[PDB]
Structure formats: structure tokens, C-alpha cells
């Protein structure tokens, strides 16, 4: 189990187990338990990445595995298959619907694949790839100027338009999560050096950093509540003060 | 083991998948599960929507009634606990802010004072009977007279009155009595006119009713008991505010323990703002809404104003909460005109619409806010469900 995601509304949730096949749950508007919608085996290497698409087009899932492939899925049943990589893929995320329906992946190799799926028929599942180049890493998109953040081993880069435009300074070890503030915009990362950093981008970069090993970091849609989760064995949630230093509100333990 | 935590929209659901294979759903701590809180919000928002407008004075102090009430009521709905404790606490802080800047005469003020004071979860009740003369009686006797609790005082005097009764009896005639200034005369006439170590404790008590600062600090056990005491027994003016509040604090420190005591000091000090960041910590909602009253009485998306900030950051709570009936509060609060537009434009997408009426509303927005990109697509889910219907009627 390396990932679990949410749809646009918050009803369904896709999960790629340890076991090559990927489940998808949903809870009843009647009683709150998490029910299974379907379960099927796509890639052979435990999946490590997952995302949902924007409903502006429909209902789709993109998987990413160590079988050097990324696949599109509709209702489920496979649509298209991406096998450009010569190296396993580690992360995947649909660009914000605001630009349209494009994609971006990253794997062992170092290929920043950006498959853009378009057509004036508007409905074709055909996808050509616009890729340019720079073990554990990942990546995150920006919603609004087409920009996305990227995490490599111990590095953190920010691309624009494939035209590098800013790097994130600091991480003294391998990064593990990258999240773009839903919006000046801000980004967060869960580094292995055992700390959470919040960088602030305008139009340049600053930092506001808070201190085991941090693993997964998340934002919500509003109140921009950040999520540090790590080997500590707990989850912490942060809000912004009147002056933008983030402070911890409350904590959840898994003792 | 490596945890991981993904986010919202909540309404109680964030996921916490880890590592062995379990999926953990979890709520945002202290998050208000909609409840009768859904009703409280709207109730304030109506006070809010009613204020769009000397005349400002009176009308404001009235809206304070409204707000105060609306909270007293919600607090009941709850009793019938964490959420209760830290709610009540907001009340006392806020029960203060009225007594100090929302009454300006002589009758209503004292009430609110006494009110504000004793309603602050302070009950010697088990100890009234744990005292049933000696030292302990005397200390207590006065603490009651300080907190304005006069009927109580007398009741507890009924113990051992019998055996200079001529004065005791008289005092009760006076305590039963409260122009008031004429009162304080009668109180002193008696103090001056006036067998053992008990005979001494008695003169003290008379000085406390007379308002002997040095003594309203002797038998006072908490900075606010004195503060009040003074106001009630020494001389009632708010232009002596800052000095009543200073003497008291040198005498007996304040509790960092209860997150309510400090805030009210700041209220008495004039330093308001230092309230609102505490307020939020208790209930983001009422804080956003006390912030506003204050402001009434008295490209830049934040640091527009301090009150205009807890508003917009309270709205953004509701838009991740899910209550279909509270969005008209979010967007209501939210309405620079071109900026709002871009904010409304990314919020409306997440509206949990159902009824044709719900959609009748959502559109009602697009008209005045001109978000045509937002309706066009709606038209498509709406248009789609219609087709799904036709395709089922023909069958």
C-alpha cells in the first residue's frame, strides 16, 4: 500500500495495495462504512502512484508501477497504456482541469513524461507525449500559469513553460512528499531529514520550517491545513497565523 | 512504520493509510460535526445580514444582545462536554466585552457585571455546606458580598446571628437595600458609629461593604473578585477602570490555567485584538463573529483588515464541511470586487447541490457574480440526468 486518493467530491477512494491489484472504495450516503466498488489486477509491481481525473471529462484513474508503465482506466476497464519509460515509474498526477487533460509521471530513469490527451472531437482517448529530463521520488501540480513541482533524491525543482524557473532550497536528505498550496502560492515537502518545510512563492522563494522521519504531506481545499505524517507514529495538522508562520492545532496518535 | 495522511473534503472523512493493510478514516480533531451548530451559524449570519446599515450605537449594543443570546441558546442545546467547556468559556470572555463597551445606564450595567462575574463557572456550592464564628466563615462571608451575591450572603449569616446586634440587624437592612450614593452614606454612618477577636472580624466586614480598597483586597481571592468588588462597593466609574484592574493584579495573580481569565483582562485594558486569536482556539465561529461586532462599534487578499480576515477564513471552513445549507453563509460572508469573483469562482464548483431549488440558488449567484463558465457546465450534468431519464421513459 503506497497510495490512496480521493475523487473531486470526496465520495470514492482508490487504493493500490501491496498486491499488484488496485481497489476502489466508496461510502454509502446511508451509513458511513467504506464499501468496495471494484478490484482488478493491472500492473505487476506493487503500485506506488495513483490519481483521479477531473470530472470535466468523466471518471478515470491513472496507475503507475515498476513495470515501466502508466495506464488510463474508465468505468472499470482499461483505456490506454503508456510505455515510453525505460524505467519504472514512482509517481503520477493529472494536470489541473483548468488547462485541460494532461498528465505527468516520474520514474527510476529520470524522464519527466508529460502525456497530453487532446482533440477537437474532444472525446478521443489518444495521447501524445511532451517529455524533458531533470532511489525514491515524486511530483505535484499547481492549480490556478502552467507550473508543477518535482521531487528527486534530495533535490526539489520547479518547472514551467518544460522550462526550469525556480528550485527549492534546503533538503539535506531524500524528499518524500510534495504538495502545492491550492491558492502568492506555497509548496510543502516531507523530507527524510526529519522535518517539514513550507516555501512561499510570489509572482522568488522563502521558507518557514518546523521539525523522526516525515513521510506524507497533504493540503485540503480551504484553510489550507497541512498534514505531516511520519515515523513518529502520529499525524499533525497546521494552520497559518495572521503572519504566515504555521502553527500546530492538534495531533492524532497511532500508539 | 511509515504513516501517510491524505486530506479532504472532510465532513468527518480524511484517510490514513499506513505501512499493515488497514484503511483508517478519521475526523479533524475538535471539528464540529454539523449538529445544532449548523443552526447557530445561520442565526448569527442573520444578525450579520441584518446590520448592513448614536443610532449606530444603540443598534450595535442590540445586535450584541442578539449574538449573546444566540450563543447562550446553542450552549444549552449542547448540555442536553469538551465542546461545552470551551464554549462556555467563550461566553464569559464575550460576556465581558459587552459589560465594558456595549452598555455605556445605571441599571443594565450592574446586572451584566454581576452576570459576567458569577456565570463564569464559579460555584462555591459544595463548600457553602462544607463550612457549616471562625476564620473560614469570615473569608467566605466577604467573598459573597464581593461577587455581588447578597441574598446568598445573608442566607449564610442566618447561622449564628443571635449572640451589638443593633448594627448587624441594621447592616442586613442595608444589604437588603441595594440615588444609591445615599446608600453608601447609611453604610458608613453605621461603620463609624461602631466582644473579642470576633469583635474585630466584624469591623472588617463593615469596611468591605463600605469599599475599603485595602480590605476588598484582603478578603478577595481572585483579581476579578476585587475588580468587581471595587466597582460595586468603592465607586462605580469606568474611568477608573485601568486603576481598579492594576491594584487587583498586584494582589493576586492570574490563571494561565483557564484560557478565559487572561482574555478578559485584555478586554479591560483596551487591548482588544489579543482576544481574537484566543477566541478562535476555542470556537473559530464565534470569534469570527465577535471580531465583526468590534469593528462595528470600533491586489491585497489578506491583511486587508483583522476582522475581515476571520470572516473569510471562517467561510473557508464551511466550504470543506459539506452542509448544503451553510454555503449561502459562506458566499454571503464573502460578499476588492474582482478578487471575491475569483474566489467565489473556485468555491461554487464544490457546492453539494441536489434540489432544483439548490440549483435555482447557485445560478442566482452566477447572475450577479457573472461566472458564466460555472453555469455552462452545470447545464451539462443537469442536461445529462434529463437524457438518462428520457432514455428510461422510452424503454
UniProtKB/Swiss-Prot annotation, chain A:
Main location: nucleus
InterPro entries listed in its UniProt record: Sec13/Seh1_fam, WD40/YVTN_repeat-like_dom_sf, WD40_repeat_dom_sf, WD40_rpt
UniProt entry tagged with the keyword Membrane: yes
GO cellular component: nuclear envelope; nuclear membrane; nuclear pore; nuclear pore outer ring; Seh1-associated complex; vacuolar membrane
Pfam families hit by this protein: WD40 (PF00400)
Record key words, sorted: Membrane, mRNA transport, Nuclear pore complex, Nucleus, Phosphoprotein, Protein transport, Repeat, Translocation, Transport, Vacuole, WD repeat
GO molecular function annotation: structural constituent of nuclear pore
Gene3D superfamilies from the UniProt entry: YVTN repeat-like/Quinoprotein amine dehydrogenase
Origin superkingdom: Eukaryota
Annotated SUPFAM superfamilies: WD40 repeat-like
GO terms under biological process: cellular response to amino acid starvation; mRNA transport; nucleocytoplasmic transport; positive regulation of TORC1 signaling; protein transport; regulation of TORC1 signaling
Membrane-related topology note: Peripheral membrane protein
Compartment annotation: Nucleus, Nuclear pore complex; Nucleus membrane; Vacuole membrane
WD repeats (start-end): 1-35, 42-75, 84-125, 131-157, 170-203, 212-248
PANTHER family given in the database record: NUCLEAR PORE COMPLEX PROTEIN SEC13 / SEH1 FAMILY MEMBER, NUCLEOPORIN SEH1
Function statement: Functions as a component of the nuclear pore complex (NPC). NPC components, collectively referred to as nucleoporins (NUPs), can play the role of both NPC structural components and of docking or interaction partners for transiently associated nuclear transport factors. Involved in nuclear poly(A)+ RNA export and NPC biogenesis. It is also required for normal nuclear morphology. Component of the SEA complex which coats the vacuolar membrane and is involved in intracellular trafficking, autophagy, response to nitrogen starvation, and amino acid biogenesis.
Miscellaneous notes: Present with 952 molecules/cell in log phase SD medium.
Family: Belongs to the WD repeat SEC13 family.
Subunit text: Component of the nuclear pore complex (NPC). NPC constitutes the exclusive means of nucleocytoplasmic transport. NPCs allow the passive diffusion of ions and small molecules and the active, nuclear transport receptor-mediated bidirectional transport of macromolecules such as proteins, RNAs, ribonucleoparticles (RNPs), and ribosomal subunits across the nuclear envelope. Due to its 8-fold rotational symmetry, all subunits are present with 8 copies or multiples thereof.
Name used for this protein in its record: Nucleoporin SEH1
Organism of derivation: Saccharomyces cerevisiae (strain ATCC 204508 / S288c)
Gene field: SEH1
UniProtKB/Swiss-Prot annotation, chain B:
GO CC annotation, single: nuclear pore
Membrane topology per record: Peripheral membrane protein
GO biological process: mRNA export from nucleus; nuclear pore localization; nucleocytoplasmic transport; positive regulation of DNA-templated transcription; protein import into nucleus; ribosomal large subunit export from nucleus
Signal peptide: none
Record key words, sorted: Membrane, mRNA transport, Nuclear pore complex, Nucleus, Protein transport, Translocation, Transport
Major subcellular location class: nucleus
Subcellular location: Nucleus, Nuclear pore complex; Nucleus membrane
GO MF annotation list: structural constituent of nuclear pore
Additional information: Present with 7920 molecules/cell in log phase SD medium.
Subunit comment: Component of the nuclear pore complex (NPC). NPC constitutes the exclusive means of nucleocytoplasmic transport. NPCs allow the passive diffusion of ions and small molecules and the active, nuclear transport receptor-mediated bidirectional transport of macromolecules such as proteins, RNAs, ribonucleoparticles (RNPs), and ribosomal subunits across the nuclear envelope. Due to its 8-fold rotational symmetry, all subunits are present with 8 copies or multiples thereof.
Function: Functions as a component of the nuclear pore complex (NPC). NPC components, collectively referred to as nucleoporins (NUPs), can play the role of both NPC structural components and of docking or interaction partners for transiently associated nuclear transport factors. NUP85 is involved in nuclear poly(A)+ RNA and pre-ribosome export, in GSP1 nuclear import, in NPC assembly and distribution, as well as in nuclear envelope organization.
Family classification: Belongs to the nucleoporin Nup85 family.
Protein name according to UniProt: Nucleoporin NUP85
Organism: Saccharomyces cerevisiae (strain ATCC 204508 / S288c)
Shown stretch of the complete protein: 65 to 555 of 744
Amino acid at each position: 500500500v503506497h497510495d490512496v486518493v480521493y475523487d473531486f467530491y470526496g465520495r470514492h477512494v482508490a487504493t493500490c495495495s501491496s498486491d499488484q491489484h488496485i481497489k476502489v472504495f466508496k461510502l454509502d450516503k446511508d451509513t458511513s462504512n467504506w464499501e468496495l466498488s471494484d478490484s482488478w489486477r493491472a500492473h505487476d509491481s506493487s503500485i506506488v502512484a495513483i490519481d483521479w481525473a477531473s470530472p470535466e471529462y468523466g471518471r478515470i484513474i491513472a496507475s503507475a508501477s515498476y513495470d515501466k508503465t502508466v495506464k488510463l482506466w474508465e468505468e472499470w476497464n482499461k483505456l490506454c497504456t503508456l510505455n515510453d519509460s525505460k524505467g519504472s515509474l514512482y509517481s503520477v498526477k493529472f494536470a489541473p482541469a483548468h488547462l485541460g487533460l494532461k498528465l505527468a509521471c516520474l520514474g527510476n530513469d529520470g524522464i519527466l513524461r508529460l502525456y497530453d490527451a487532446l482533440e477537437p472531437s474532444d472525446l478521443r482517448s489518444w495521447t501524445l507525449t511532451s517529455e524533458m529530463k531533470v532511489s525514491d521520488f515524486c511530483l505535484s501540480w499547481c492549480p490556478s500559469p502552467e507550473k508543477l513541482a518535482v521531487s528527486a533524491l534530495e533535490q526539489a525543482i520547479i518547472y514551467q513553460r518544460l522550462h526550469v524557473a525556480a528550485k527549492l532550497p534546503g533538503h539535506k536528505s531524500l524528499i518524500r512528499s510534495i504538495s502545492w498550496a491550492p491558492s502568492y502560492q506555497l509548496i510543502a515537502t516531507g523530507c527524510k531529514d526529519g522535518r517539514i518545510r513550507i516555501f512561499k512563492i510570489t509572482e522568488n522563494l522563502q521558507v518557514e520550517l518546523l521539525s523522526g522521519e516525515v513521510w506524507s504531506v497533504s493540503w485540503n481545499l480551504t484553510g489550507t491545513i497541512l498534514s505531516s505524517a511520519g515515523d513518529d507514529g502520529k499525524v499533525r495538522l497546521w494552520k497559518a497565523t495572521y503572519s504566515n508562520e504555521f502553527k500546530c492545532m492538534s495531533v492524532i496518535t497511532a500508539q | 512504520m511509515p504513516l501517510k495522511f491524505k486530506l479532504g473534503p472532510l465532513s468527518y472523512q480524511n484517510m490514513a493509510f499506513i505501512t499493515k493493510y488497514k484503511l483508517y478514516p478519521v475526523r479533524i480533531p475538535r471539528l464540529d460535526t454539523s449538529k445544532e451548530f449548523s443552526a447557530y451559524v445561520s442565526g448569527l449570519f442573520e444578525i450579520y445580514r441584518d446590520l448592513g446599515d448614536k443610532e449606530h450605537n444603540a443598534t450595535v449594543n442590540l445586535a450584541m444582545e442578539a449574538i449573546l443570546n444566540e450563543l447562550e441558546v446553542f450552549i444549552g442545546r449542547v448540555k442536553d462536554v469538551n465542546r461545552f467547556y470551551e464554549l462556555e468559556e467563550s461566553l464569559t470572555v464575550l460576556n465581558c466585552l459587552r459589560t465594558m463597551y456595549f452598555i455605556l445606564n445605571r441599571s443594565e450595567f450592574i446586572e451584566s457585571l454581576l452576570n459576567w462575574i458569577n456565570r463564569s463557572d464559579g460555584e462555591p456550592d459544595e463548600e457553602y455546606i462544607e463550612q457549616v464564628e471562625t476564620q473560614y466563615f469570615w473569608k467566605l462571608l466577604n467573598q459573597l458580598v464581593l461577587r455581588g451575591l447578597l441574598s446568598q450572603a445573608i442566607g449564610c449569616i442566618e447561622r449564628s446571628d443571635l449572640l451589638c446586634a443593633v448594627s448587624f440587624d441594621a447592616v442586613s437592612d442595608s444589604i437588603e437595600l441595594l440615588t444609591f450614593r445615599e446608600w453608601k452614606n447609611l453604610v458608613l454612618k453605621l461603620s463609624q458609629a461602631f466582644s473579642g477577636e470576633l469583635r474585630d472580624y466584624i469591623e472588617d466586614f463593615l469596611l468591605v461593604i463600605g469599599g475599603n480598597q485595602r480590605k476588598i483586597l484582603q478578603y478577595s481571592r481572585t483579581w476579578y473578585e476585587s475588580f468587581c468588588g471595587f466597582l460595586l462597593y468603592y465607586i462605580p466609574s469606568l474611568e477608573l477602570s485601568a486603576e481598579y484592574l492594576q491594584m487587583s493584579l498586584e494582589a493576586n495573580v492570574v490563571d494561565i490555567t483557564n484560557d478565559w481569565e487572561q482574555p478578559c483582562v485584555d478586554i479591560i485594558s483596551g487591548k482588544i485584538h489579543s482576544i481574537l486569536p484566543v477566541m478562535e482556539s476555542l470556537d473559530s465561529c464565534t470569534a469570527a463573529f465577535t471580531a465583526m461586532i468590534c469593528e462595528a462599534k470600533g491586489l491585497f487578499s489578506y491583511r486587508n483588515g483583522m476582522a475581515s480576515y476571520m470572516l473569510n477564513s471562517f467561510a473557508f471552513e464551511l466550504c470543506s464541511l459539506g452542509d448544503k445549507e451553510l454555503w449561502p453563509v459562506a458566499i454571503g460572508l464573502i460578499a476588492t470586487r474582482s478578487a471575491k469573483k475569483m474566489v467565489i469562482a473556485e468555491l461554487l464548483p464544490h457546492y453539494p447541490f441536489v434540489t432544483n431549488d439548490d440549483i435555482e440558488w447557485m445560478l442566482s449567484i452566477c447572475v450577479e457574480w457573472r461566472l458564466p463558465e460555472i453555469a455552462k457546465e452545470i447545464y451539462t450534468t443537469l442536461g445529462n440526468q434529463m437524457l438518462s431519464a428520457h432514455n428510461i421513459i422510452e424503454s
